[PDB]
Design a protein around this ligand. Structure first.
Ligand SMILES: *[C@@H]1O[C@H](CO)[C@@H](O[C@@H]2O[C@H](CO)[C@@H](O[C@@H]3O[C@H](CO[C@H]4O[C@H](CO)[C@@H](O)[C@H](O[C@H]5O[C@H](CO)[C@@H](O)[C@H](O)[C@@H]5O)[C@@H]4O)[C@@H](O)[C@H](O[C@H]4O[C@H](CO)[C@@H](O)[C@H](O)[C@@H]4O[C@H]4O[C@H](CO)[C@@H](O)[C@H](O)[C@@H]4O[C@H]4O[C@H](CO)[C@@H](O)[C@H](O)[C@@H]4O)[C@@H]3O)[C@H](O)[C@H]2NC(C)=O)[C@H](O)[C@H]1NC(C)=O
Ligand SMILES: *[C@@H]1O[C@H](CO)[C@@H](O[C@@H]2O[C@H](CO)[C@@H](O[C@@H]3O[C@H](CO[C@H]4O[C@H](CO)[C@@H](O)[C@H](O[C@H]5O[C@H](CO)[C@@H](O)[C@H](O)[C@@H]5O)[C@@H]4O)[C@@H](O)[C@H](O[C@H]4O[C@H](CO)[C@@H](O)[C@H](O)[C@@H]4O[C@H]4O[C@H](CO)[C@@H](O)[C@H](O)[C@@H]4O[C@H]4O[C@H](CO)[C@@H](O)[C@H](O)[C@@H]4O)[C@@H]3O)[C@H](O)[C@H]2NC(C)=O)[C@H](O)[C@H]1NC(C)=O
Ligand SMILES: *[C@@H]1O[C@H](CO)[C@@H](O[C@@H]2O[C@H](CO)[C@@H](O[C@@H]3O[C@H](CO)[C@@H](O)[C@H](O[C@H]4O[C@H](CO)[C@@H](O)[C@H](O)[C@@H]4O[C@H]4O[C@H](CO)[C@@H](O)[C@H](O)[C@@H]4O[C@H]4O[C@H](CO)[C@@H](O)[C@H](O)[C@@H]4O)[C@@H]3O)[C@H](O)[C@H]2NC(C)=O)[C@H](O)[C@H]1NC(C)=O
Ligand SMILES: *[C@@H]1O[C@H](CO)[C@@H](O[C@@H]2O[C@H](CO)[C@@H](O)[C@H](O)[C@H]2NC(C)=O)[C@H](O)[C@H]1NC(C)=O
Ligand SMILES: *[C@@H]1O[C@H](CO)[C@@H](O)[C@H](O)[C@H]1NC(C)=O
Ligand SMILES: *[C@@H]1O[C@H](CO)[C@@H](O)[C@H](O)[C@H]1NC(C)=O
Ligand SMILES: *[C@@H]1O[C@H](CO)[C@@H](O)[C@H](O)[C@H]1NC(C)=O
Ligand SMILES: *[C@@H]1O[C@H](CO)[C@@H](O)[C@H](O)[C@H]1NC(C)=O
Ligand SMILES: *[C@@H]1O[C@H](CO)[C@@H](O)[C@H](O)[C@H]1NC(C)=O
Ligand SMILES: *[C@@H]1O[C@H](CO)[C@@H](O)[C@H](O)[C@H]1NC(C)=O
Ligand SMILES: [Cl-]
Length: 968
């Protein structure tokens, strides 16, 4: 009704009147703020066979100052959308306002701690607070809708609006209608889709006011126990999802808006390498094919690429990395076996239209397969073909199971295999067997081996099939032609002709066979060989693949290669490929246009040969260049003390006074005489400092303090220059009560208590009504024994200027409250000429905080994608210390020696200057009376990739400039 570009029925979306299965990956632009690398991710997603990406926008990063929306430069969404368009990827836009996303505040800016109203409710104070943000971000989204020639096809209002408490009459139809109307009022006409955290029917079509267009829900069924990555708990495989769908939203396509693609990992967790093992290739093939058993038509994987929680953007439970164990790693590599496995399923879905028009049946333990050890879920079509999802009935089983099938076909029901032998399902695997499968007018009566892809070319048809090692498979084709083996041995290939078919049996081998039946060639592959195949769209007008439309899907070619094939196009007599290589690679092209006479790879003329079956072959040699990385320990390190506050000369007269008698925080009433909540004063991010002035009686004994920074925070306390102690932190503690013994004080003299508190980020707000994002940061309680609370007058600081934040280029979260950060010394070219020469490897000999600066040059070669990492040593149990590392002003490492787990910190090209000068600024906070130092600090690299990527422009890296608003 509002537009005709994106429509739907009960089975699927239609894009311009044509059915499409939306297969999407989650990618957050704020977690990879380099536009050329955003294109890289999109191309890697397109190469999976996917057609869509889903993204959040993080409000906290783009309206750090209330009333000043800023989504420019590294936060600009427009180049992100243009990269999607260039890669041929549609978009699902998810701007919140609430996003969760393991991000600080769940996306909410810290100034929402001053809103007198329930967050995510119809309370006017909350709704008013969101209006400026939504009117801006939804306008930008509206501009790039498919209706205007852009990539954006779906819009999600809100996020997991599923749980309420604490007086909210949940679900509130007035609230969701308001949120939906905000988007519509900004020009969004595309369909609205929700993402209910459970299949709870919230806001489904037919619920009236507040209903979305398409009901969606989320699912993370294998959970998050990354420490036990081989354990698949009983009952974790979903079976009822289609049943629930038909009850909850039968008129719309079945949609999972976030299906598990990895896992979060908290401070002190096992690490994302473990998460990648839990959500590995086996998880994908069993759980994702299980989603196909429900006839899922919109499927988005959270995350496909996670990136990095740089500049304090992450929530307090998480650390710097957001690798997530996803198919594309944090450093952008696609080496994980789960990437290649996922590509097999994405490419199946891309070419199998009968999947969407079939009639799904209930799961079975008999009737299709001949054993109750297997479960088969049928999707039955008459003329349009059927699909049979096979798995172990006990989904965690690692047993090898022999079986036979009884399948319905247009030629009659058949027991498979016909020619002898049995099929095998080896352990944690699942197959989609097909019947009456259409290969451009050629009917595949059945195939037990799975379809990777098929194409019609000018000189014939090609079908690509694969099985796992040790499997026997069989197929049958509607034809009067016989079968001929045209590549590979005839060994273990059996066949029979009937009146109207040919039947072919085969055993999986590491050596490819190609068979020919009439004008159809069939590749018979093992899974590990199929991992190396790619199906780029072949452009004939320009160089860009275009979106996954029926015509552009049909025009694709089949390329065997190695690490990556990005694109293909035909220009005159030239066939052009763009691809990446991490080893010497044999390239084969199947379906070369008749007019192509010359091969180009990444623009370079490349020799080729043609075999007797018309396949082009070429070789791309890999010879990694010398990568010369400077020794970080040998740099000319300059040091400055970044806790001058504990010197008796320090003058804090320009610091904000923490003197508000009333809090604007509705969640927690004050238990101190004035507010010491950082967000009451506009300080939401990074290290916080508090200074408490009093005049001593001389009879003081102890000072007690309750500090709160979120999970794994630490704090340190001094009385003038005398170290009192630290809370060194635990993941289990978001606050801590300490009682410190004081030295003997002199009656009538003034003293200042300096408190440093690590703010780990603001809490999320998952349950509507609970207002947990309002959880304060700072000092909750204090008691100077024998003195009234009012004896201490407090000052505080976070990032200089608070909400009037200094760095408009790097955003409102990047820098905290340390002296060196307040001065802007973390940026390139600090005023360090007269600073002392000292290294973070030398470090501190007492409790305190040091700031260290050094530059280094890189001269890495053009045409190579080279992942670089910062490494902080932890070979033996350390003393407690905390580190931040700024790279050209951008914070790309937060490190807690005693909690971990992260020691390896990837930093992307664009943040790093590969042919230029780079700046490291390192803060070292020793939470120990004996001080602390780094064990080691090193740059490293992983496998250089010979890349098709264009040059990466360095992002804006503002140099140090004296700040007039500083407290000096
Ligand atoms: C694709 O992207 C991925 C994500 O971005 C990326 O994965 C990341 O890769 C980096 C670099 O390899 C990882 O950091 C390293 O991790 C090492 C520990 O992990 C290994 O060992 C574990 C325990 O045995 C294994 O569980 C683990 O396997 C798991 O993870 C693998 C992926 O990492 C995966 O493939 C497996 O299937 C599995 O799931 C893994 O094998 C750690 O040792 C290493 O630190 C050393 O190296 C640094 C330089 O790179 C140094 O700065 C540092 O000081 C360490 O060097 C010292 O120790 C080494 C080993 O003992 C020695 O060889 C060195 O010479 C050196 O020795 C000195 O110091 C010693 C004290 O430590 C001392 O004993 C000696 O005397 C000497 O003085 C580093 O932290 C990171 O963890 C990965 N991240 C994730 C999320 O996985 C992947 O690399 C990308 N791939 C490509 C191709 O690009
Ligand atoms: C250039 O780019 C290339 C990509 O284009 C890139 O190539 C890829 O490289 C990665 C490794 O980085 C490959 O993934 C690994 O593959 C390993 C080899 O097995 C594969 O190939 C065999 C044939 O050669 C197959 O037989 C094998 O199938 C079997 O195993 C599958 C996986 O378990 C299973 O699903 C199948 O059904 C079948 O049973 C497979 O296809 C593979 O061993 C390895 O798996 C381990 O690591 C994964 C995490 O990285 C885990 O998810 C997985 O469970 C395995 O974990 C084990 O090993 C880890 C250490 O690495 C430990 O941490 C774990 O605890 C665990 O170890 C325990 O269990 C072991 C049993 O497996 C046991 O022996 C141990 O003692 C211990 O008890 C992983 O999947 C990928 O296949 C390559 N892709 C392509 C397309 O080639 C290349 O590396 C790049 N080059 C450079 C230089 O950068
Ligand atoms: C450098 O090297 C050093 C030396 O090796 C490293 O030091 C080690 O660091 C380890 C990781 O931080 C640390 O282990 C931790 O020990 C604490 C006990 O003090 C323990 O709580 C931790 O385990 C929990 O937390 C982690 C995440 O931080 C989880 O992965 C784990 O499953 C545990 O989770 C439980 O507690 C959480 C917090 O309360 C809950 O959120 C969670 O749901 C779960 O709760 C259940 O269990 C609780 C009891 O455990 C129970 O109360 C609750 O009701 C629930 O049922 C973790 O094991 C080592 O102690 C430390 N070793 C030494 C010698 O110091 C250092 O990290 C390295 N540094 C770097 C940078 O790599
Ligand atoms: C503790 O530190 C404070 C300042 O942080 C010191 O305050 C000074 O006190 C002297 C008088 O002794 C004044 O003349 C100065 O103006 C104060 N300086 C500042 C910056 O306020 C205080 O003396 C220290 N306490 C002790 C016992 O040494
Ligand atoms: C399929 O399963 C549903 C849900 O349990 C049930 O209501 C229905 O009877 C089943 N249909 C058939 C044809 O067995
Ligand atoms: C098979 O595909 C051809 C063209 O690719 C089409 O004309 C025909 O309708 C399809 N057949 C079925 C049964 O879907
Ligand atoms: C069909 O091909 C097979 C070999 O692939 C052969 O045994 C058989 O004789 C052929 N049939 C005819 C009628 O030529
Ligand atoms: C919120 O507003 C109510 C009603 O005006 C007022 O009583 C209350 O003090 C306010 N609370 C905060 C924390 O500002
Ligand atoms: C001084 O402190 C001691 C020990 O707490 C206590 O006995 C005494 O009451 C204090 N003096 C005054 C004047 O409060
Ligand atoms: C610190 O003390 C306060 C007040 O008694 C209490 O509410 C809080 O839970 C305590 N914190 C911890 C971490 O035990
Ligand atoms: Cl200052």
């Amino acid at each position: 009704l509002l537009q005709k570009y994106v429509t739907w029925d009960d089975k699927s979306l239609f894009i311009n009147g044509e059915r499409i299965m939306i297969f999407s990956g989650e990618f957050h632009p704020f977690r990879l703020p380099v536009k050329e690398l955003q294109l890289d991710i999109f191309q890697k997603v397109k190469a999976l066979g996917f057609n869509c990406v889903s993204f959040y926008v993080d409000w906290a990063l783009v309206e750090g100052k209330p009333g000043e929306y800023r989504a420019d430069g590294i936060f600009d969404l427009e180049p992100f959308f243009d990269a999607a368009s260039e890669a041929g990827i549609y978009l699902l836009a998810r701007p919140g306002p609430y996003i969760n996303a393991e991000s600080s505040g769940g996306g909410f800016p810290g100034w929402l701690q001053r809103v007198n109203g329930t967050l995510r409710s119809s309370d006017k104070a909350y709704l008013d607070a969101t209006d400026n943000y939504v009117s801006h971000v939804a306008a930008t989204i509206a501009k790039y809708q498919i209706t205007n020639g852009g990539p954006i096809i779906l819009y999600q209002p809100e996020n997991e609006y599923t749980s309420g408490c604490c007086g909210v009459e949940f679900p509130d139809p007035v609230y969701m209608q308001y949120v939906e109307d905000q988007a519509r009022n900004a020009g969004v006409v595309i369909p609205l889709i929700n993402n209910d955290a459970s299949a709870s029917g919230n806001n489904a079509p037919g619920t009236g006011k507040g209903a979305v267009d398409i009901y969606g829900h989320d699912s993370y069924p294998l959970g998050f126990d990354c420490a036990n990555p081989t354990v698949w708990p009983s009952g974790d495989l979903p079976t009822n999802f289609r049943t629930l769908h038909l009850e909850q939203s039968p008129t719309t396509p079945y949609a999972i808006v976030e299906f598990q693609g990895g896992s979060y990992d908290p401070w002190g967790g096992p690490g994302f390498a473990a998460c990648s093992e839990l959500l590995n290739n086996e998880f994908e093939r069993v759980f994702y094919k299980n989603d196909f058993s429900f006839q899922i038509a919109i499927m988005n994987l959270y995350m496909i690429f996670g990136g990095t929680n740089w500049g304090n953007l992450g929530y307090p439970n998480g650390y710097t990395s957001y690798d997530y164990g996803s198919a594309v790693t944090e450093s952008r590599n696609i080496t994980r076996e789960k990437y290649s496995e996922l590509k097999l399923l994405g490419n199946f879905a891309k070419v199998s239209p009968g999947y969407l028009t079939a009639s799904p049946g209930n799961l079975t333990t008999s009737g299709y397969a001949d054993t109750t050890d297997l479960t088969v879920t049928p999707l039955l079509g008459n003329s349009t073909g059927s699909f049979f999802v096979v798995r172990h009935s006990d989904y965690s089983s690692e047993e090898s199971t022999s079986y036979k099938l009884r399948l319905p076909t247009s030629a009659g029901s058949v027991t498979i295999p016909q020619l002898g032998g049995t099929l095998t399902l080896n352990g944690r695997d699942s197959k989609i067997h097909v019947t009456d499968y259409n290969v451009s007018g050629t009917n595949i009566i059945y195939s037990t081996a799975e379809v990777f892809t098929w194409k019609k070319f000018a000189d014939g048809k090609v079908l690509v099939l694969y099985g796992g090692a040790g499997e026997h498979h069989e197929l049958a084709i509607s034809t009067k032609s016989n079968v001929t083996v045209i590549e590979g041995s005839e060994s273990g290939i059996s066949s029979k002709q009937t009146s109207s078919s040919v039947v072919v049996g085969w055993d999986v081998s590491t050596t490819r066979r190609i068979i020919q039946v009439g004008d159809l060639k069939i590749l018979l592959l093992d899974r590990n060989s199929a991992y190396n195949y790619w199906v780029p769209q072949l452009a004939t007008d320009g160089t860009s693949p275009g979106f996954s439309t029926p015509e552009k899907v049909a025009s694709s070619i089949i390329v065997k290669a190695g690490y990556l094939v990005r694109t293909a196009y035909l220009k005159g007599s030239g066939l052009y490929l763009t691809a990446d290589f991490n080893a010497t690679t044999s390239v084969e092209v199947i379906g070369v246009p008749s007019t192509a006479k010359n091969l180009f790879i990444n623009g370079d003329k490349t020799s080729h040969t043609v075999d007797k079956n018309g396949i082009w072959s070429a070789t791309v040699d890999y010879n990694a260049p010398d990568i010369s990385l400077p020794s970080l320990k040998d740099l000319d390190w300059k040091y400055v003390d970044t806790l001058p506050e504990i010197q008796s000369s320090y003058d804090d007269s320009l610091w904000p006074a923490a003197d508000l008698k009333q809090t604007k925080n509705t969640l927690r009433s004050l238990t101190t005489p004035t507010s010491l909540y950082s967000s009451d004063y506009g300080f939401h991010t990074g290290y916080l400092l508090y200074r408490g002035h009093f005049t001593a009686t001389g009879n003081e004994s102890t000072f007690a303090i309750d500090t709160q920074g979120g999970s794994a925070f630490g704090s340190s306390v001094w009385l003038n220059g005398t170290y009192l102690g630290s809370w060194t932190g635990l993941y289990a503690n978001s606050d801590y009560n300490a009682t410190y013994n004081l030295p003997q004080l002199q009656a009538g003299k003034t003293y200042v208590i300096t408190v440093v508190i690590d703010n780990m980020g603001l809490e999320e707000n998952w349950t509507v009504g609970e207002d947990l994002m309002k959880t304060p940061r700072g000092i909750l309680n204090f008691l100077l024994a024998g003195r009234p609370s009012s004896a201490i007058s407090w000052k505080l600081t976070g990032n200089l200027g608070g909400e009037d934040y200094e760095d408009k280029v790097r955003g409102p979260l990047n820098e905290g409250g340390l002296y060196a950060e307040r001065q802007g010394f973390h940026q390139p070219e600090p005023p360090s000429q007269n600073w002392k020469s000292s290294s973070p490897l030398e470090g501190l000999s007492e409790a305190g905080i040091g700031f260290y600066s050094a530059s280094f040059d890189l001269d890495l070669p053009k045409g190579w994608d080279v992942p670089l990492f910062l490494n902080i040593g932890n070979s033996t149990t350390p003393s407690p210390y905390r580190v931040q590392v700024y790279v050209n002003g951008y914070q790309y490492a937060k490190y807690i020696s005693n909690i971990g787990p992260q020691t390896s910190f990837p930093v992307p090209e664009g943040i790093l200057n590969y042919r230029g000068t780079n700046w490291l600024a390192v803060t070292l906070w020793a939470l120990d009376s004996a001080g602390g130092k780094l064990e080691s600090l090193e740059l490293s690299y992983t496998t250089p990739v010979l890349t098709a990527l264009g040059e990466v422009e360095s992002v804006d890296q503002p140099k140090y400039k004296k700040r007039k608003g500083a407290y000096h």
